[PDB]
Each structure stands twice: as structure tokens, then as C-alpha cells.
Homo-oligomer: A and B are copies of this chain.
Amino acid sequence: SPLNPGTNVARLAEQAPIHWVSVAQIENSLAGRPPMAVGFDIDDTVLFSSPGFWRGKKTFSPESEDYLKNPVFWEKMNNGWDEFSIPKEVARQLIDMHVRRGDAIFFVTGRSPTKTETVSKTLADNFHIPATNMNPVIFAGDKPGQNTKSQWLQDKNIRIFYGDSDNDITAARDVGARGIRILRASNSTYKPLPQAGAFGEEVIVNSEY
């Protein structure tokens, strides 16, 4: 509010009590452990997919969140608009690390399911995921016949789950998996940004890009 608010060195040096980690520290923590299943949220975790959601909002519901309940939007979103989604560097590093380990890589999303989807292909191509490590995207939710993110983590015996939202971390917590937080980019159109670290979970440094 003030024109010249100023600052002080206590504020400049102030740190939130967050357990920050690096990809290297995560890899070290898994040293010796045999191949296992690991999981990733998609949106704002491995892909900056705001471009599609932004276009979707403008096209189908400029004045509300109704586009997210619109099957015409989801068809477009899941069948080509991820060509405009920008893969995150943190995800390249994590996926490379887990492939090097021989881990099974799963993607678990809350996106609404569609007749067909090319998201799995986009992910395998962009992250250079060998077919042997790759698994088709799981569309999780509370719709009839679906299973929740938590149930899927149990089902696939996923030991580590990476995600940007509170629900991603609590999904891991509910089933005894290690939930590791990725920072949502500040130019995401999905606001407010989550409070990374709100469950005392590990948060990956510099993971906004």
C-alpha cells in the first residue's frame, strides 16, 4: 500500500521453515534400493499446462470455471493441446534419475477422462521415457468407476509421489508413500499458489521450472 514500503535485513534474510531437498539428495537417499514404482502428478508438476487451460477458459467459460466441467474442453486438452505445454526441468532431472534407477514411472492426474488421450504419448516423447519404464496415464478421481489418487498409489505400490498440490501430498501421506512437493510456477493460471511444505514434506529446490 505505501508508495515506498522499504525493507530491513531481518525480512531480507527471513526463511520459512521448509525441508528443501535437491534431486541429488533424493537420489542419494535411494542408494542401494532395488527398482520400485514412483508416481508423478502432471499439471504444474511435470508440465506447465496453463497454456491449454488458459485457452480452454477463454473459449468455453470466459466468466467462470465451467470449462472444467465441459467434455468439449477435455477432448481438446487431452488430445493435442499439451503440444503447447512446457516440460519442467525438475521433471526431466527426476525422470532421468528414476529411469537410471530402473524404476517404473507412473503419471496420476485429476484431469477428466476422455474417449482417447495423447497425454501419455506426449510425456513419453518429451521426457525420453523408455517403453519399459513408461505406463499409461492414470485418470484418478471420485467419479463412478474411478479410483482416487490415494487408491491408485496403493494399487501400483507407488513408493514416492511427486506433486504440486496439497491433495498430491496428502494422497501420498494417506497410504504411507513419500510425498515430495514441486513448486507451482508463479505464471500458472491455477491460483492461489499452494503452500509448498504445509505438511512438513520435502520440497524440491528451484522446481518452478
Contacts and interface: CB of A to CB of B under 8 A. Distances in A.
B186 A10 contact: yes
B10 A209 contact: yes
Contacts of A28: 3
Copies in the complex: 4
Nearest to A185: B187
A30 interface: no
A7 B16 contact: yes
- In the complex, which range does the number of interface residues on chain A fall in? 35 or more
Nearest to A50: B86
A192 B8 CA distance: 10
B51 A187 contact: no
A196 interface: yes
Interface stretch (A19-27, A95-103, A134-142, A144-152): A19-27
Contacts of A195: 5-8
Contact of A84 (B24, B84, B187): B84
Given A4-B197, A10-B193, A54-B86, 18 more contacts: A2-B198, A3-B200, A6-B198, A7-B18, A8-B196, A10-B206, A10-B209, A11-B16, A12-B183, A16-B205, A17-B20, A18-B20, A48-B187, A51-B85, A54-B84, A81-B84, A84-B84, A86-B189
Interface of A: 2-22, 24-25, 28, 48, 50-52, 54-55, 58, 81, 83-86, 88, 183-187, 189, 192-200, 205-206, 208-209
